[PDB]
mmCIF file of C-alpha atoms and ligand atoms in Angstrom:
data_model
loop_
_atom_site.group_PDB
_atom_site.id
_atom_site.type_symbol
_atom_site.label_atom_id
_atom_site.label_comp_id
_atom_site.label_asym_id
_atom_site.label_seq_id
_atom_site.Cartn_x
_atom_site.Cartn_y
_atom_site.Cartn_z
ATOM 1 C CA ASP A 48 113.950 117.826 121.590
ATOM 2 C CA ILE A 49 116.221 115.019 120.356
ATOM 3 C CA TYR A 50 118.467 116.918 117.906
ATOM 4 C CA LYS A 51 119.267 119.548 120.572
ATOM 5 C CA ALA A 52 120.432 116.942 123.080
ATOM 6 C CA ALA A 53 122.350 115.258 120.234
ATOM 7 C CA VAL A 54 124.296 118.398 119.371
ATOM 8 C CA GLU A 55 124.830 119.016 123.083
ATOM 9 C CA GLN A 56 126.336 115.453 123.248
ATOM 10 C CA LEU A 57 128.893 116.257 120.539
ATOM 11 C CA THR A 58 132.516 116.214 121.697
ATOM 12 C CA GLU A 59 134.355 119.505 121.433
ATOM 13 C CA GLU A 60 136.314 117.776 118.650
ATOM 14 C CA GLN A 61 133.132 117.063 116.742
ATOM 15 C CA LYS A 62 131.905 120.622 117.200
ATOM 16 C CA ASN A 63 135.147 122.084 115.789
ATOM 17 C CA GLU A 64 134.852 119.607 112.946
ATOM 18 C CA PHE A 65 131.219 120.536 112.348
ATOM 19 C CA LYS A 66 132.147 124.230 112.089
ATOM 20 C CA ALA A 67 135.066 123.436 109.754
ATOM 21 C CA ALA A 68 132.666 121.459 107.652
ATOM 22 C CA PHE A 69 130.459 124.538 107.190
ATOM 23 C CA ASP A 70 133.588 126.659 106.429
ATOM 24 C CA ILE A 71 134.401 124.257 103.661
ATOM 25 C CA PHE A 72 130.797 124.354 102.390
ATOM 26 C CA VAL A 73 131.093 128.164 102.037
ATOM 27 C CA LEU A 74 134.543 127.871 100.402
ATOM 28 C CA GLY A 75 133.049 125.487 97.811
ATOM 29 C CA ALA A 76 130.522 128.144 96.665
ATOM 30 C CA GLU A 77 133.078 130.878 96.332
ATOM 31 C CA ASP A 78 133.551 129.705 92.701
ATOM 32 C CA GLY A 79 129.776 130.126 92.033
ATOM 33 C CA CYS A 80 128.844 126.431 92.186
ATOM 34 C CA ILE A 81 128.222 123.621 94.538
ATOM 35 C CA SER A 82 129.355 120.226 93.209
ATOM 36 C CA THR A 83 129.180 116.537 94.314
ATOM 37 C CA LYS A 84 132.823 116.628 95.342
ATOM 38 C CA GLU A 85 132.382 119.714 97.440
ATOM 39 C CA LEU A 86 129.445 118.176 99.158
ATOM 40 C CA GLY A 87 131.383 114.833 99.530
ATOM 41 C CA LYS A 88 134.041 116.656 101.478
ATOM 42 C CA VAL A 89 131.605 118.554 103.824
ATOM 43 C CA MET A 90 130.151 115.047 104.557
ATOM 44 C CA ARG A 91 133.622 113.509 105.279
ATOM 45 C CA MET A 92 134.350 116.288 107.738
ATOM 46 C CA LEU A 93 131.027 115.427 109.443
ATOM 47 C CA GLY A 94 132.388 111.836 109.753
ATOM 48 C CA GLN A 95 130.205 110.288 107.070
ATOM 49 C CA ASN A 96 131.169 108.361 103.998
ATOM 50 C CA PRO A 97 130.342 110.361 100.835
ATOM 51 C CA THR A 98 127.364 109.183 98.832
ATOM 52 C CA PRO A 99 128.454 110.583 95.411
ATOM 53 C CA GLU A 100 125.637 108.954 93.383
ATOM 54 C CA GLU A 101 122.822 110.235 95.644
ATOM 55 C CA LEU A 102 124.416 113.707 95.561
ATOM 56 C CA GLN A 103 124.794 113.780 91.761
ATOM 57 C CA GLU A 104 121.120 112.731 91.555
ATOM 58 C CA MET A 105 119.981 115.541 93.784
ATOM 59 C CA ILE A 106 122.108 117.898 91.610
ATOM 60 C CA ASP A 107 121.010 116.451 88.292
ATOM 61 C CA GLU A 108 117.312 116.731 89.093
ATOM 62 C CA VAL A 109 117.642 120.560 89.415
ATOM 63 C CA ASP A 110 120.575 121.027 86.974
ATOM 64 C CA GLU A 111 118.948 122.979 84.080
ATOM 65 C CA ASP A 112 122.083 124.427 82.433
ATOM 66 C CA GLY A 113 123.660 121.007 82.190
ATOM 67 C CA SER A 114 126.794 122.248 84.153
ATOM 68 C CA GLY A 115 126.851 119.079 86.300
ATOM 69 C CA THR A 116 126.997 121.454 89.278
ATOM 70 C CA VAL A 117 124.463 123.824 90.906
ATOM 71 C CA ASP A 118 124.631 127.573 90.621
ATOM 72 C CA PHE A 119 122.935 129.898 93.138
ATOM 73 C CA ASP A 120 119.447 129.611 91.557
ATOM 74 C CA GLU A 121 119.640 125.839 91.140
ATOM 75 C CA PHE A 122 120.861 125.557 94.768
ATOM 76 C CA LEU A 123 117.688 127.400 95.904
ATOM 77 C CA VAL A 124 115.486 124.836 94.164
ATOM 78 C CA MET A 125 117.643 122.022 95.528
ATOM 79 C CA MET A 126 117.273 123.539 99.025
ATOM 80 C CA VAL A 127 113.448 123.600 98.975
ATOM 81 C CA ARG A 128 113.540 120.017 97.780
ATOM 82 C CA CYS A 129 115.613 118.548 100.818
ATOM 83 C CA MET A 130 113.279 120.095 103.373
HETATM 84 C C1 DXC B 287 124.058 124.928 118.849
HETATM 85 C C2 DXC B 287 125.274 123.989 118.809
HETATM 86 C C3 DXC B 287 126.050 124.243 120.098
HETATM 87 C C4 DXC B 287 125.541 123.376 121.242
HETATM 88 C C5 DXC B 287 126.356 123.820 122.421
HETATM 89 O O1 DXC B 287 125.943 124.782 123.128
HETATM 90 O O2 DXC B 287 127.440 123.226 122.610
HETATM 91 C C6 DXC B 287 126.237 124.171 117.614
HETATM 92 C C7 DXC B 287 127.399 123.158 117.575
HETATM 93 C C8 DXC B 287 127.824 122.995 116.097
HETATM 94 C C9 DXC B 287 126.991 124.065 115.404
HETATM 95 C C10 DXC B 287 126.843 124.067 113.877
HETATM 96 C C11 DXC B 287 128.198 123.849 113.173
HETATM 97 C C12 DXC B 287 128.187 124.239 111.689
HETATM 98 C C13 DXC B 287 127.487 125.562 111.330
HETATM 99 C C14 DXC B 287 128.453 126.719 111.623
HETATM 100 C C15 DXC B 287 127.852 128.086 111.298
HETATM 101 O O3 DXC B 287 128.842 129.065 111.655
HETATM 102 C C16 DXC B 287 126.524 128.294 112.042
HETATM 103 C C17 DXC B 287 125.525 127.150 111.788
HETATM 104 C C18 DXC B 287 126.105 125.734 111.989
HETATM 105 C C19 DXC B 287 125.159 124.771 111.307
HETATM 106 C C20 DXC B 287 126.204 125.429 113.514
HETATM 107 C C21 DXC B 287 124.889 125.678 114.296
HETATM 108 C C22 DXC B 287 125.005 125.504 115.816
HETATM 109 O O4 DXC B 287 125.799 126.527 116.417
HETATM 110 C C23 DXC B 287 125.679 124.197 116.194
HETATM 111 C C24 DXC B 287 124.706 123.038 115.948
HETATM 112 C C1 DXC B 288 122.461 124.368 102.770
HETATM 113 C C2 DXC B 288 121.443 123.408 103.382
HETATM 114 C C3 DXC B 288 121.553 123.425 104.917
HETATM 115 C C4 DXC B 288 122.943 123.831 105.437
HETATM 116 C C5 DXC B 288 123.278 123.236 106.799
HETATM 117 O O1 DXC B 288 122.436 123.295 107.728
HETATM 118 O O2 DXC B 288 124.409 122.717 106.966
HETATM 119 C C6 DXC B 288 121.456 121.970 102.802
HETATM 120 C C7 DXC B 288 120.642 121.696 101.513
HETATM 121 C C8 DXC B 288 121.282 120.442 100.868
HETATM 122 C C9 DXC B 288 122.239 119.973 101.965
HETATM 123 C C10 DXC B 288 123.342 118.939 101.711
HETATM 124 C C11 DXC B 288 122.808 117.653 101.094
HETATM 125 C C12 DXC B 288 122.907 116.490 102.073
HETATM 126 C C13 DXC B 288 124.332 116.273 102.611
HETATM 127 C C14 DXC B 288 124.325 114.943 103.390
HETATM 128 C C15 DXC B 288 124.560 114.965 104.905
HETATM 129 O O3 DXC B 288 123.687 114.004 105.506
HETATM 130 C C16 DXC B 288 124.321 116.330 105.535
HETATM 131 C C17 DXC B 288 125.137 117.405 104.836
HETATM 132 C C18 DXC B 288 124.926 117.515 103.312
HETATM 133 C C19 DXC B 288 126.285 117.819 102.696
HETATM 134 C C20 DXC B 288 124.045 118.746 103.079
HETATM 135 C C21 DXC B 288 124.781 120.028 103.489
HETATM 136 C C22 DXC B 288 123.665 121.020 103.781
HETATM 137 O O4 DXC B 288 122.856 120.503 104.854
HETATM 138 C C23 DXC B 288 122.791 121.268 102.541
HETATM 139 C C24 DXC B 288 123.604 121.949 101.426
#
């Protein structure tokens, strides 16, 4: 399909950046949360401009403990919502 060709068309630079981006994603959660900032940074590494407001919204809509971030259980609900 289209996404498979797209990833195949990535430069080697972009691929090493894409992998770093996931490394940083994982590093973010090592503290038990995923925040807007953490996600902003994964996005930058992917070459995109952060969309902090849209991220906070996605967080806020599942944020039941009022932390302003997502824990593991809130991240699961967030996950089923993107897809
Ligand atoms: C499948 C292509 C490779 C295409 C090719 O053969 O060049 C690669 C290139 C970049 C790869 C992604 C980079 C970030 C992630 C790293 C993780 O550790 C494993 C899953 C992810 C999401 C990767 C999945 C997959 O491995 C991708 C999409
Ligand atoms: C964890 C899964 C899938 C992980 C993956 O395949 O990289 C999903 C659920 C919510 C996803 C994030 C929200 C959208 C974000 C906007 C970008 O347009 C693509 C990457 C980001 C930062 C996403 C990273 C990652 O795609 C997440 C956290």
